[PDB]
Amino acid sequence: DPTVSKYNVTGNNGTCLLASMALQLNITYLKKDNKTVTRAFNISPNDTSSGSCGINLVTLKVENKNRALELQFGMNASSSLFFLQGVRLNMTLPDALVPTFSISNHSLKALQATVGNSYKCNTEEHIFVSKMLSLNVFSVQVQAFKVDSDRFGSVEECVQDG
Ligand SMILES: *[C@@H]1O[C@H](CO)[C@@H](O)[C@H](O)[C@H]1NC(C)=O
Ligand SMILES: *[C@@H]1O[C@H](CO)[C@@H](O)[C@H](O)[C@H]1NC(C)=O
Ligand SMILES: *[C@@H]1O[C@H](CO)[C@@H](O)[C@H](O)[C@H]1NC(C)=O
Ligand SMILES: *[C@@H]1O[C@H](CO)[C@@H](O)[C@H](O)[C@H]1NC(C)=O
């Protein structure tokens, strides 16, 4: 299993993202020898993390020498819901036909919960990013935008955990 890592993003108005989650990139690509391969790359506890705050956009970037993954969270003030709305990936794969590439999708809606509550799920979710890339959220507790007393709000647990 991927390792559960903790994340805290703080900016001008304090903490805007709390997360405890295990993540894995599942990528299908063409190797130099013209063959297709599918590999998993776990987000490592060792990765460098950072992020940014705002009232429309909250980001978390996890990176190392060969890879940078950015999660973008959005929210709808009229509904007071937050959600993962985007994924950006930069990667270098030495054995790929195209070694250095990017994959993105900014039309996502996952990990959705009420603003002021936290999203929690222990059931693996394979989030489609492109035909060739999924973000596997192996387990997660996450909260974006509004954070009170620097801790998770009440849990909204995915139905599948039942
Ligand atoms: C902080 O709050 C102010 C006032 O609510 C808002 O205008 C500003 O965009 C917020 N900044 C961040 C980084 O969330
Ligand atoms: C990917 O690389 C481009 C160009 O260097 C950069 O603008 C972008 O922020 C990078 N994306 C991530 C998620 O680091
Ligand atoms: C934002 O919330 C309002 C109120 O529920 C709704 O009318 C609107 O369609 C929502 N936007 C999106 C993108 O869901
Ligand atoms: C991005 O993800 C959304 C949600 O699954 C999907 O509807 C859309 O087709 C995706 N875009 C691409 C280019 O894969």
UniProtKB/Swiss-Prot annotation:
Localization: Lysosome membrane; Endosome membrane; Late endosome membrane; Cell membrane
Disruption phenotype: Deficient mice are viable and fertile. However, mice deficient in both Lamp1 and Lamp2 are embryonic lethal, with the accumulation of autophagic vacuoles in many tissues. In addition, LAMP1 deletion results in increased NK-cell apoptosis upon target cell-induced degranulation.
Origin: domain of life: Eukaryota
Known glycosylation sites: N8, N13, N26, N34, N46, N76, N90, N105
Region ranges (Second lumenal domain): 13-162
UniProt PTM: O- and N-glycosylated; some of the N-glycans attached to LAMP-1 are polylactosaminoglycans.
Cysteine disulfide partners in this protein: C16-C53, C121-C158
SUBUNIT field: Interacts with ABCB9; this interaction strongly stabilizes ABCB9 and protects ABCB9 against lysosomal degradation. Interacts with FURIN. Interacts with TMEM175; inhibiting the proton channel activity of TMEM175.
Entry's family note: Belongs to the LAMP family.
Functional summary from the UniProt entry: Lysosomal membrane glycoprotein which plays an important role in lysosome biogenesis, lysosomal pH regulation, autophagy and cholesterol homeostasis. Acts as an important regulator of lysosomal lumen pH regulation by acting as a direct inhibitor of the proton channel TMEM175, facilitating lysosomal acidification for optimal hydrolase activity. Also plays an important role in NK-cells cytotoxicity. Mechanistically, participates in cytotoxic granule movement to the cell surface and perforin trafficking to the lytic granule.
Protein name stated in the entry: Lysosome-associated membrane glycoprotein 1
Organism (species): Mus musculus (Mouse)
Positions spanned in the full protein: 208 to 368 of 406
